[PDB]
Amino acid sequence: LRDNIQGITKPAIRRLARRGGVKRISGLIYEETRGVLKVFLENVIRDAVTYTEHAKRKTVTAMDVVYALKRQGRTLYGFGG
Amino acid sequence: KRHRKVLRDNIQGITKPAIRRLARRGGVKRISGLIYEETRGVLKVFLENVIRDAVTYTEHAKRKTVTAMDVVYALKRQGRTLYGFGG
Amino acid sequence: VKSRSSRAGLQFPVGRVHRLLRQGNYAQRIGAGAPVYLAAVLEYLTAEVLELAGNAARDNKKTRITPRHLQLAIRNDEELNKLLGRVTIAQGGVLPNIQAVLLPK
Amino acid sequence: VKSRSSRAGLQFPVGRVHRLLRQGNYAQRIGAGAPVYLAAVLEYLTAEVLELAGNAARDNKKTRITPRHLQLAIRNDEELNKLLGRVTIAQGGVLPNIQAVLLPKK
Amino acid sequence: PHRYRPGTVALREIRRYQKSTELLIRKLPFQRLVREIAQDFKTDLRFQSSAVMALQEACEAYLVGLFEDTNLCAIHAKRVTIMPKDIQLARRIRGERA
Amino acid sequence: PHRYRPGTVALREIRRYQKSTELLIRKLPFQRLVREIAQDFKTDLRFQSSAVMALQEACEAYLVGLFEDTNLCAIHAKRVTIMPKDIQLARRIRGERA
Amino acid sequence: RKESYSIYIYKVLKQVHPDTGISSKAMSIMNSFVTDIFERIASEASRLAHYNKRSTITSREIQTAVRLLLPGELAKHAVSEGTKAVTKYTSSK
Amino acid sequence: RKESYSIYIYKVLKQVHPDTGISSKAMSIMNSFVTDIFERIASEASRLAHYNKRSTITSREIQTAVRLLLPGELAKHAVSEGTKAVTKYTSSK
DNA sequence: ATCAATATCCACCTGCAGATTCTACCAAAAGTGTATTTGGAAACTGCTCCATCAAAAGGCATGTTCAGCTGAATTCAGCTGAACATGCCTTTTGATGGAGCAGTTTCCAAATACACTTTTGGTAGAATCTGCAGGTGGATATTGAT
DNA sequence: ATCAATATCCACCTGCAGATTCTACCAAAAGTGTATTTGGAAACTGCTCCATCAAAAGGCATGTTCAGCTGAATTCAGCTGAACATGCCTTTTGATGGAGCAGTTTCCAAATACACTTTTGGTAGAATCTGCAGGTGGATATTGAT
Ligand SMILES: [Cl-]
Ligand SMILES: [Cl-]
Ligand SMILES: [Cl-]
Ligand SMILES: [Cl-]
Ligand SMILES: [Cl-]
Ligand SMILES: [Cl-]
Ligand SMILES: [Cl-]
Ligand SMILES: [Cl-]
Ligand SMILES: [Mn+2]
Ligand SMILES: [Mn+2]
Ligand SMILES: [Mn+2]
Ligand SMILES: [Mn+2]
Ligand SMILES: [Mn+2]
Ligand SMILES: [Mn+2]
Ligand SMILES: [Mn+2]
Ligand SMILES: [Mn+2]
Ligand SMILES: [Mn+2]
Ligand SMILES: [Mn+2]
Ligand SMILES: [Mn+2]
Ligand SMILES: [Mn+2]
Ligand SMILES: [Mn+2]
Ligand SMILES: [Mn+2]
Ligand SMILES: [Mn+2]
Ligand SMILES: [Mn+2]
Ligand SMILES: [Mn+2]
Ligand SMILES: [Mn+2]
Ligand SMILES: [Mn+2]
Ligand SMILES: [Mn+2]
Ligand SMILES: [Mn+2]
Ligand SMILES: [Mn+2]
Q1: For position G21, which CATH number holds?
Q2: What Rg do the C-alpha atoms of chain C give, in angstroms?
Q3: How many CB atoms are located within 10 Å of the residue E87 CB?
Q4: Could you check: is the Cβ of residue H1 within 7 Å of any atom of nucleic acid strand J?
Q5: Calpha distance H32→F29 (Å, rounded)
Q6: For strand J, is any atom closer than 7 Å to the CB of F83?
Q7: What SS3 class is residue A38?
Q8: In total, how many domains does chain A have?
Q9: Using the 8-state DSSP alphabet, how is residue G51 labeled?
Q10: d(CA E88, CA G92)
Q11: Judging by DSSP bridges, how do beta strands B30-31 and D87-89 pair with one another?
Q12: Ligand minimally distant from the alpha carbon of residue C1
């Protein structure tokens, strides 16, 4: 038993930081990162599911996510629109 | 029959004490001597962009007078929505 | 003759809102409930920021709400601040706020 | 019988662009020339990023354009980068870039 | 001979201008600046006075807004003095360019 | 016994992952997380695999960008180590906070 | 021939604050506010009708748009007001 | 049945690099690109027509929208191509 | 910077599964040809509203002097975060079977759009009201020197 | 822990520019009565999607050691804030001529609206290809020590 956000592990966060050009990482970064990540996902998923509900569906489609992302000013290319 | 005097160097009309005041409203306590020129540059870019889009709206309307609505629409294009001017 | 606003129990003009919906190029047809709902929401939001602004006016010994009172009302309210987080209020100024590290001692 | 795309000298579907304009709730009437103009613009921009991405794939010694190649193409070009400054390309990665202060001294 | 220590009048000014809402750039100079820029983009242009005023409202709101972020960047560097470096950082993170 | 000096492997990794385009969070834990968060908004929900993938793409892009701005803030403070402080400053200036 | 929301805004003002007035600049700002929120909600509604191949914007579209645009509590109260206005309206002849 | 810009994008790909291919994911990304820019230009044109109480989105609206949406150089070339296609289309009976 | 010694990369070739291109047909758009409307451009033109202009005066911008305290440089120690070896467990994956739903028809009842035809609500100024911005002067507080 | 030297408040006053009320038309709601659609609402698919299962594989968690980085301390030069003198130029007020919005008609060039007639773009199998993952063997980079 472990929490799901803790399933977002330290080395994965580290790899992401590496792609962002970070050379050295404070030990307190990982929890902070998990927090920010959770806020992001909450916002996006909330919007997406709202689209779902409006479409009277039970399956969150990729288009729902793309539309939600466009609402948050984070347009994604490559998933149907 | 007469044309207006040449306009030039009017960015210097953005005086040091005025920039100082703006910083004060920004809650800034101390200011490096090189701030005012940077501020003038940044301001000029901002104004150039907004006025460009505005004037584009004017042109498209086949007008010669820039309206407050032109500026409001222009500002909204740039994610800087303005209230108060018939917006 | 019965105002649709009246029938909806609203101050905001339901008929005008319906017309603007028709003229705004949003959809081919507009349901009869949509302008009712929209005008209701608009009126509610109006009431909320007018409530908070009226409070700001009273706090400043003022009878008449100004752009300043509106700004203070909005920026001091998390939800309205977020709703209008990219809106500029002319003649509104800013919230008094000084970073602690800038104070003496 | 000749399509309006052929008559406008375009690869992109003028008729389809017209239909999309009508069905997109933009105005009550759509002029004849608007779908032509729009189709031409979309085709030009497509040619642009396709060319730069083609170059990027040639540089990578690849024949087939990938998301990565489109990303390298777009980010390395000032204007396409500006035009898509708030667009995320799936499986595109990032430009190799390391702040000088992070490199070894001697 | 009386003399306030440096910083005192600065904080006084912060309180003063954060209390008020008046435009802080002189009107006529800003109007001239606007006419200059516009003219360089297109000649024979006329301006509604309220359009100039809107432009000034936008410009001052933007600059006050930018100075807050700048102040935060200087304070992040354990400084009290804002520097071009700070403005540049703020505008980079904001997604503004050069 | 061989050992690389601290910083070396890190730079290695920066070059490696700046070259690749692979998702860096492991797929299943992320799908778990997504389904939980989503569960809090509506229950008995199903997810297109392309929807979960779109989420992870958008997400990792977001976090990599934020790590860039964060790194800039740490370098601004004459540091080389990113700290929560840095992420905070970046997110405030981004408009995601205050 | 320029119309605004001024009299409606004033009505609501008197409702929440009977002894409080509003300056014309502030009323102008209020007018901008109402037109803005109008446009955001109507645009979102348009978009939502479009996504689901629908040609009609019903109260349901306005509602989802409201839930998308407005932050929590504001949204909840807005939804309340909208629903009540609608039911009250449909009960009338 | 669903439709996309795939074949037109591929045709332009051949017109611009004759011996270059494109992966499916890349093709999706290009589709999203065309759809996006379409929506931007169309939306702005709509706004333009609305601002001037016009009911028709003509080539001119698309032009101004292009000038407002595309950065300098790209905008110039886009306007060029547009005018070219429209004159050529007016030049075919 | 040179002597040696791990590891890291980089080059060139290689073989193949996973995808990509190419081929072969049918509804659905796209194109035509009429029959109408209808938007909006042209041509006066009634009138706000912008551009000058003038002229007086004081609110501020400019420039100088000068000293305080801020930023930048330097040093140093301790403790944090990186590198690495070790060993365990969760992710990946790969069909497989089942079944929960999206995606599409197929009807009609309700709702919406028309086209006229009355009925009011809202707007543009004129006619009354009245907060509040500015101007003073005395109390309270704030700040900085001995 | 006290005194001067300013700045900060808060109350009280008063005419004015700005807000609130009063009247008067007209476009805009609202009311009727046909005339279409539109999006449900049941009954069924085909299809992704969930749930197991079952290994193997890397990838993650753990712990030790310690390089090197961050933050604290100290110093000082010089930048920048405060105060002051000087005089410019922005601000204010009011008028005037006319450029250029808009408001109204007057009408066709252009779009819409059907009715058919064609043709193209999609779909589901068919037919080759590009890299990717591997494999040396050759230099490079990195680190400790003459
Ligand atoms: Cl976000
Ligand atoms: Cl409805
Ligand atoms: Cl009843
Ligand atoms: Cl004066
Ligand atoms: Cl069941
Ligand atoms: Cl009335
Ligand atoms: Cl009446
Ligand atoms: Cl129905
Ligand atoms: Mn046209
Ligand atoms: Mn379920
Ligand atoms: Mn009340
Ligand atoms: Mn109340
Ligand atoms: Mn070789
Ligand atoms: Mn195969
Ligand atoms: Mn007409
Ligand atoms: Mn000294
Ligand atoms: Mn210091
Ligand atoms: Mn120094
Ligand atoms: Mn040590
Ligand atoms: Mn081992
Ligand atoms: Mn079923
Ligand atoms: Mn006062
Ligand atoms: Mn008066
Ligand atoms: Mn002087
Ligand atoms: Mn004239
Ligand atoms: Mn064919
Ligand atoms: Mn064909
Ligand atoms: Mn075909
Ligand atoms: Mn390989
Ligand atoms: Mn390879």
Answers
A1: 1.10.20.10
A2: 19
A3: 23
A4: yes
A5: 28
A6: yes
A7: helix
A8: 1
A9: H
A10: 61
A11: unpaired
A12: 7
How long, in residues, is chain B? 87
* D36 sits in which H/E element: helix D33-59
Q: Which residues of F58-77 are buried (b: 16+ CB within 10 A; e: fewer)?
A: bbbbbbbbbbbbbbbbbbbb
Q: Does domain F1-98 have CATH number 1.10.238.10?
A: no
Nearest CB to C86; choose among B25, B81, B85: B81
Domain housing B48: 1-87
Residue H37 CB contacts under 8 Å (≥ 6 apart), including other chains: D41, D42, D45, H69
C-alpha of residue D11 to centroid of ligand 9, in Å: 19
Cα diameter, chain A:
47
Domain count, chain H: 1
Contact in structure between F38 and F46 (CB atoms under 8 Å): no
Taking the C-alpha atoms of residue B59 and residue B66, their distance in angstroms, rounded to an integer, is 9
DSSP state of C97: -
Beta bridge partners of B44: none
Nearest to C63 among G20, G37, G61 (CB): G20
Question: What residue in F sits closest to E91 (Cα-Cα)?
Answer: F93
CB within 8 Å: H33 and A77: yes
Distance F25 CA to J56 C1' (A): 21
Q: Which letter, b or e, does each residue of A44-63 get, where b requires 16 or more Cβ atoms within 10 Å of its Cβ?
A: bbbbbbbbbbbbeeeebbbb
**D1-106 maps to CATH 3.90.380.10:** no
What resolution in angstroms, rounded to 1 decimal?
2.8
- Chains C, H: CB contacts within 8 A come to 3
Long-range interactions of E60-64: CB distance < 8 A, separation 24+: E60/B22, E60/E23, E60/E24, E60/E25, E61/B80, E61/C88, E62/B46, E62/B80, E63/B19, E63/B22, E63/B26, E63/B39, E63/B42, E63/B43, E63/B46, E64/B22, E64/B25, E64/B26, E64/C94
The answer to whether F80 CB is within 7 Å of strand J is: yes
The backbone torsions φ and ψ at residue D91, rounded to the nearest 5 degrees and listed phi first, read 60, 35
Rg, C-alpha atoms of chain G: 16
User: Hey, what are G92's tokens?
Assistant: 């009338």
CB-based contact H86:D36 (threshold 8 Å): yes
In the DSSP assignment, the letter for residue C64 is E
In 3D, which of F97, B2, C14, H60 has the Cα closest to residue E68?
Answer: F97
In CATH terms, is domain C1-105 a member of 1.10.20.10?
yes
Find, among G68, D57, A80, the residue nearest to H24 by Cα. A80
Output b/e per residue, H42-66; b: 16+ Cβ within 10 A.
bebbbbbbbeeeeeebbbbbbbbbb
φ, ψ for residue B18, nearest 5 deg: -70, -45
> Which residues 12-31 in chain F have a CB closer than 7 A to strand J?
26
Q: Are D69 and D53 in contact (CB under 8 A)?
A: yes
Q: Give me F22's structure tokens.
A: 């692979």
- Burial code of C30-64, b = ≥16 C-beta within 10 A, e = fewer? bbebbbbbbbbbbbbbbbbbbebbbbbbeeeebee
Expt. technique = X-ray
Instruction: For residue C97, give the nearest of B27, B29, B79 by CB distance.
Output: B27
B18 CA → I63 C1’, Å: 17
Q: How far is the CA of A18 from the C1' of J144 (A)?
A: 28
Q: How far apart are CA F11 and CA D97, in angstroms?
A: 11
Domain residue limits at G87:
1-93
Alpha helices in chain C (DSSP H): 4-8, 14-23, 33-59, 67-75, 78-83
